[PDB]
Motif scaffolding. Structure first.
Motif, mmCIF file in Angstrom:
data_model
loop_
_atom_site.group_PDB
_atom_site.id
_atom_site.type_symbol
_atom_site.label_atom_id
_atom_site.label_comp_id
_atom_site.label_asym_id
_atom_site.label_seq_id
_atom_site.Cartn_x
_atom_site.Cartn_y
_atom_site.Cartn_z
ATOM 1 N N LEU A 105 0.824 -1.205 0.000
ATOM 2 C CA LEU A 105 0.000 0.000 0.000
ATOM 3 C C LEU A 105 0.860 1.258 0.000
ATOM 4 C CD1 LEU A 105 -2.788 -1.093 2.514
ATOM 5 C CD2 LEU A 105 -2.905 -1.058 0.019
ATOM 6 N N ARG A 146 2.050 2.611 -3.303
ATOM 7 C CA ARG A 146 1.064 3.365 -4.065
ATOM 8 C C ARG A 146 0.912 4.795 -3.572
ATOM 9 N NH1 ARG A 146 -4.197 -0.252 -3.787
ATOM 10 N NH2 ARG A 146 -4.959 1.509 -5.056
ATOM 11 N N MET A 205 -5.081 -4.731 -2.448
ATOM 12 C CA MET A 205 -6.535 -4.777 -2.425
ATOM 13 C C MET A 205 -7.022 -5.896 -1.515
ATOM 14 S SD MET A 205 -7.947 -4.060 -6.279
ATOM 15 C CE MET A 205 -9.619 -4.459 -5.773
ATOM 16 N N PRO A 228 -13.795 -7.904 -3.600
ATOM 17 C CA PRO A 228 -14.541 -6.662 -3.371
ATOM 18 C C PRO A 228 -16.008 -6.830 -3.734
ATOM 19 C CG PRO A 228 -13.152 -6.474 -5.318
ATOM 20 C CD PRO A 228 -12.758 -7.745 -4.632
ATOM 21 N N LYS A 249 -11.449 -12.215 -9.282
ATOM 22 C CA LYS A 249 -11.377 -11.737 -10.651
ATOM 23 C C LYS A 249 -9.951 -11.313 -10.998
ATOM 24 C CE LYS A 249 -16.177 -10.173 -10.504
ATOM 25 N NZ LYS A 249 -17.095 -9.000 -10.491
ATOM 26 N N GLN A 250 -9.704 -11.182 -12.289
ATOM 27 C CA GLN A 250 -8.363 -10.880 -12.775
ATOM 28 C C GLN A 250 -8.056 -9.398 -12.573
ATOM 29 O OE1 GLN A 250 -7.822 -11.845 -16.884
ATOM 30 N NE2 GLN A 250 -5.652 -11.272 -16.926
ATOM 31 N N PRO A 251 -6.909 -9.046 -11.990
ATOM 32 C CA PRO A 251 -6.546 -7.627 -11.898
ATOM 33 C C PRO A 251 -6.406 -7.005 -13.281
ATOM 34 C CG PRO A 251 -5.182 -8.952 -10.435
ATOM 35 C CD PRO A 251 -5.927 -9.907 -11.310
ATOM 36 N N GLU A 252 -6.470 -5.674 -13.311
ATOM 37 C CA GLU A 252 -6.494 -4.931 -14.566
ATOM 38 C C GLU A 252 -5.306 -5.287 -15.453
ATOM 39 O OE1 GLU A 252 -9.004 -3.466 -15.399
ATOM 40 O OE2 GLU A 252 -8.628 -1.900 -16.891
ATOM 41 N N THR A 270 -17.359 0.751 -4.124
ATOM 42 C CA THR A 270 -17.255 -0.548 -4.779
ATOM 43 C C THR A 270 -16.994 -0.397 -6.272
ATOM 44 O OG1 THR A 270 -18.783 -1.476 -3.143
ATOM 45 C CG2 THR A 270 -18.384 -2.757 -5.136
ATOM 46 N N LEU A 303 -13.125 -0.057 -6.756
ATOM 47 C CA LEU A 303 -12.408 -1.325 -6.672
ATOM 48 C C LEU A 303 -12.629 -2.155 -7.931
ATOM 49 C CD1 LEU A 303 -13.230 -2.184 -2.943
ATOM 50 C CD2 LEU A 303 -11.190 -1.067 -3.837
ATOM 51 N N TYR A 304 -13.882 -2.262 -8.379
ATOM 52 C CA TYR A 304 -14.175 -3.032 -9.584
ATOM 53 C C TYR A 304 -13.385 -2.516 -10.779
ATOM 54 C CZ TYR A 304 -18.183 -5.458 -7.421
ATOM 55 O OH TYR A 304 -18.990 -6.244 -6.633
ATOM 56 N N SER A 305 -13.304 -1.192 -10.940
ATOM 57 C CA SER A 305 -12.636 -0.625 -12.106
ATOM 58 C C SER A 305 -11.234 -1.190 -12.279
ATOM 59 C CB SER A 305 -12.571 0.899 -11.987
ATOM 60 O OG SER A 305 -11.639 1.291 -10.996
ATOM 61 N N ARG A 306 -10.582 -1.561 -11.180
ATOM 62 C CA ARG A 306 -9.250 -2.147 -11.228
ATOM 63 C C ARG A 306 -9.270 -3.627 -11.586
ATOM 64 N NH1 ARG A 306 -6.726 -0.754 -5.559
ATOM 65 N NH2 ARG A 306 -4.845 -1.560 -6.606
ATOM 66 N N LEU A 307 -10.449 -4.216 -11.763
ATOM 67 C CA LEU A 307 -10.588 -5.587 -12.232
ATOM 68 C C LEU A 307 -11.022 -5.555 -13.691
ATOM 69 C CD1 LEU A 307 -12.637 -6.856 -9.154
ATOM 70 C CD2 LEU A 307 -10.150 -6.872 -9.410
ATOM 71 N N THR A 347 -12.663 -7.477 -15.387
ATOM 72 C CA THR A 347 -14.065 -7.835 -15.575
ATOM 73 C C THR A 347 -14.982 -6.643 -15.341
ATOM 74 O OG1 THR A 347 -13.500 -10.045 -14.760
ATOM 75 C CG2 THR A 347 -15.840 -9.503 -14.964
ATOM 76 N N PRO A 384 -15.640 -2.225 -14.670
ATOM 77 C CA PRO A 384 -15.513 -1.047 -15.534
ATOM 78 C C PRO A 384 -14.085 -0.845 -16.021
ATOM 79 C CG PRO A 384 -16.864 -0.532 -13.631
ATOM 80 C CD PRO A 384 -16.338 -1.918 -13.410
ATOM 81 N N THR A 416 -7.321 7.303 -5.088
ATOM 82 C CA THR A 416 -6.658 6.024 -4.875
ATOM 83 C C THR A 416 -7.443 4.844 -5.428
ATOM 84 O OG1 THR A 416 -7.650 5.929 -2.664
ATOM 85 C CG2 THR A 416 -5.399 6.784 -2.841
ATOM 86 N N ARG A 417 -8.679 5.060 -5.871
ATOM 87 C CA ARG A 417 -9.509 3.994 -6.427
ATOM 88 C C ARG A 417 -9.772 2.904 -5.387
ATOM 89 N NH1 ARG A 417 -6.074 5.672 -10.710
ATOM 90 N NH2 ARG A 417 -7.232 6.274 -12.591
ATOM 91 N N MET A 419 -8.613 2.705 -1.921
ATOM 92 C CA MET A 419 -7.741 2.433 -0.787
ATOM 93 C C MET A 419 -8.388 2.897 0.511
ATOM 94 S SD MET A 419 -3.774 3.152 -1.867
ATOM 95 C CE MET A 419 -3.305 3.032 -0.141
#
Ligand SMILES: CN1CCN(Cc2ccc(-c3cnc(Nc4ccc(C#Cc5cc(C6OCCO6)ccn5)cc4)nc3N[C@H]3CC[C@@H](O)CC3)cc2)CC1
Ligand SMILES: CN1CCN(Cc2ccc(-c3cnc(Nc4ccc(C#Cc5cc(C6OCCO6)ccn5)cc4)nc3N[C@H]3CC[C@@H](O)CC3)cc2)CC1
Ligand SMILES: [Cl-]
Ligand SMILES: [Cl-]
Ligand SMILES: [Cl-]
Ligand SMILES: [Cl-]
Ligand SMILES: [Cl-]
Ligand SMILES: [Mg+2]
Lengths: 236, 250
Positions: A80, A83, A172, A176, A194-197, B85, B88-92, B94, B96, B182-183, B185
Motif C-alpha cells: 500500500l 502506491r 486490495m 470486493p 477476478k483478474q486484476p487490470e 465498490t 475497486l471493480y474498475s481495477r478488475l 471484468t 468497468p 486512490t480507487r 484504498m
C-alpha cells in the motif's frame, strides 16, 4: 529446550504491532559474539531447525519468542505504501513476481517437510533488509472452500493464490463487493477472485489454478515456484 | 402537513436484501406511484420530521427521498451501486474500464456540487464517504446516507470536542477525494483506528497518492487544515475542482 535464552540478555523496546495472543515488540539480543542484535519479540524448537532464506528463522525463547528484525515490515502494508508518494517507488512487475517466487520458495520448503501454514496471507509475509520476502505466522477470504466445510498443504496453495492476488493488486482486499458470510456460497457456486487490470493472463492462469475446486487438481508449491520463475525469466 | 411524506405500506413490495445499514438492513422493492407505474427503489431500516425537511430537496448530485413507510426509508434504485465498490471493480478487468483522471474529477465535482447544495441549507452530512455515494444511471454521483440518525473520516476537532460543523464535512470530503484518487484504498494505510487522534494531532495527514497531481493534492490537503476556519467551503472547493477539470484535455 536447547535454544532457550537467558532472559537477561534481552532489552525490550517499543511496540511494533499486535499478535494473536499478545503484542510484538522490538528488542536488542546480546549474542555469544558480544555484539547486540536488533530483534523482534512476541514446539518452537521445531522451527530452530528450519533453515531457508525465504523462511523466517527462530533465534531463541525466553514466555517470549525472539525473532529477527525486518526493517521493511509486512508485505501487505508495504504494497500500500508503494502506491503513495514518499513511500517506496512504484513496484514494477518483475519485483512483484519476485515477491511471489520468494513465498513459493518458502512454501516449497515447508511443504517438503509436511508443515502446514494455516494463515498464509500478504500480511503474514515479511521483507528482509535485502527486500527478500520470507513467510511467517506459521481470515475467511483466504481459506480454501473445502476447509470452510471442515486442511492440507493444498489449502496453503489456495491461500498462496490469494496472496498472489494481494500482490498483483498491490494491497486490495480479496473479493470486493462480497461479505465474509457470502464467501462459501460465492465460492460454492463456482466464483473466484477476478483478474486484476494490468495482470498478465500468464500470471492469472497460475493463481487461478490454485483455486480449483478439487484440491488434488491444484499444483504443488514446487510446480508453482517454477511457473513463476519461468514467467519472470520471460520478462525483460 | 407532515402527512405528505408518509407512503401507504400496501403500495410497497419488498424483495431481496442488498446490504446492511448501520441501524437496519437494506432491501430492494417496487414503489407503486400515483402515476400508476411501479418504480424500483431501495428500502433502508422526531425521526419522521427530518424526512420531511429532506423531501423538499431537489438536486441531481443529492439523492432524493421518495417517502417513508411504517419505519422504512424509500429511495431510488441505482443499478451501478455505491462509488467505493465501483472504484475497486474498475481495477478488475471484468469490471468497468480503467477510470481516467478526468472521470475521477467529475466524481469529485458532483459530490462537491451536492455538498454545496446542502451547506446552502445548513444541512450537515455527518458521515460523508465513498461508500455513502451512489452512482446514477448516467454515472453522476449523488451523496446519500445523510441525516436521520468511521474514525478515519471524522475531523480532528470532531474527535475530541464532539463537535461537528460544515468544516467537519469538508474534512470527510477531503478524505473522500483521497478514496477517489486512490480507487478504493482505505485511508491511512499502516495506522490503526485507535491511533488516529494521536496521528492527526502530531500533524500527520493522508499521503499524496502515487500519480495524483500536486494541484489535486493541495486541494484535498486544504480540507484537513488543523483550524476549521482555514478549510475552504464546499462552494470554493467545487469551483477549484471544476477549473482543474477544465484545464485537462477532453
Ligand atoms: C516501510 N516501513 C518500514 C518501517 N516499518 C516499520 C516496521 C516495524 C516493525 C517491523 C517488524 C520487524 N520484525 C518483525 N519480526 C517478526 C516476524 C514474524 C512474526 C510472526 C510470526 C512468527 C515468527 C516466527 C519467527 O521466529 C523467528 C523468525 O521468525 C515464527 C513463527 N511465527 C513476528 C515478528 N516484525 C515486524 N513487524 C510485525 C509487527 C506486527 C505484526 O502483526 C506484523 C508485522 C518492521 C517494520 C513500517 C513500514
Ligand atoms: C439481481 N440483483 C442482484 C445484483 N444486484 C446488484 C446491485 C444490488 C444493489 C444495488 C443498490 C441499488 N440502489 C442503492 N440505493 C441506496 C441509496 C442510499 C442508501 C443509503 C440511504 C440512506 C439515506 C438517507 C437519506 O435519505 C434522504 C437523504 O438521505 C439516510 C440514511 N441512509 C442505500 C441504498 N444501493 C444499492 N447497493 C448499495 C447498498 C449499500 C452498500 O452495501 C453498497 C451497495 C445495486 C446493484 C442487483 C440485482
Ligand atoms: Cl527488557
Ligand atoms: Cl474479485
Ligand atoms: Cl411487501
Ligand atoms: Cl435522486
Ligand atoms: Cl496515508
Ligand atoms: Mg500476523
Amino acid at each position: 529446550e536447547d535454544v532457550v535464552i537467558d532472559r537477561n540478555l534481552l532489552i525490550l523496546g517499543k511496540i511494533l504491532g499486535e499478535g494473536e495472543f499478545g503484542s510484538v515488540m522490538e528488542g536488542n539480543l546480546k549474542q555469544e559474539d558480544g555484539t547486540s542484535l536488533k530483534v523482534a519479540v512476541k514446539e518452537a524448537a521445531c522451527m530452530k531447525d528450519f533453515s531457508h532464506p525465504n523462511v523466517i528463522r527462530l533465534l531463541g525463547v525466553c514466555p517470549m519468542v525472539i525473532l529477527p528484525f525486518m526493517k521493511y515490515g509486512d508485505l501487505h502494508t508495504y504494497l500500500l505504501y508503494s502506491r503513495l508518494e514518499t513511500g517506496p517507488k512504484h513496484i514494477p512487475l518483475q519485483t512483484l513476481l519476485k515477491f511471489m517466487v520468494d513465498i513459493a520458495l518458502g512454501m516449497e520448503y515447508l511443504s517438503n517437510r509436511n508443515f502446514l501454514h494455516r494463515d498464509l496471507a500478504a500480511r503474514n509475509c515479511m521483507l528482509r533488509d535485502d527486500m527478500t520476502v520470507c513467510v511467517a505466522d506459521f481470515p475467511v477470504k483466504w481459506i480454501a472452500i473445502e476447509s470452510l466445510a471442515d486442511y492440507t498443504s493444498k489449502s496453503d496453495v489456495w491461500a498462496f493464490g490469494v496472496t498472489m492476488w494481494e500482490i498483483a493488486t498491490r494491497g486490495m482486499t480479496p473479493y470486493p463487493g462480497v461479505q465474509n458470510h457470502e464467501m462459501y456460497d460465492y465460492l460454492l457456486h463456482g466464483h473466484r477472485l477476478k483478474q486484476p487490470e494490468d495482470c498478465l493472463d500468464e500470471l492469472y492462469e497460475i493463481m487461478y489454478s490454485c483455486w480449483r475446486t478439487d484440491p488434488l487438481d491444484r499444483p504443488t508449491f514446487s510446480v508453482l515456484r517454477l511457473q513463476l520463475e519461468k514467467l519472470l525469466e520471460s520478462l525483460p
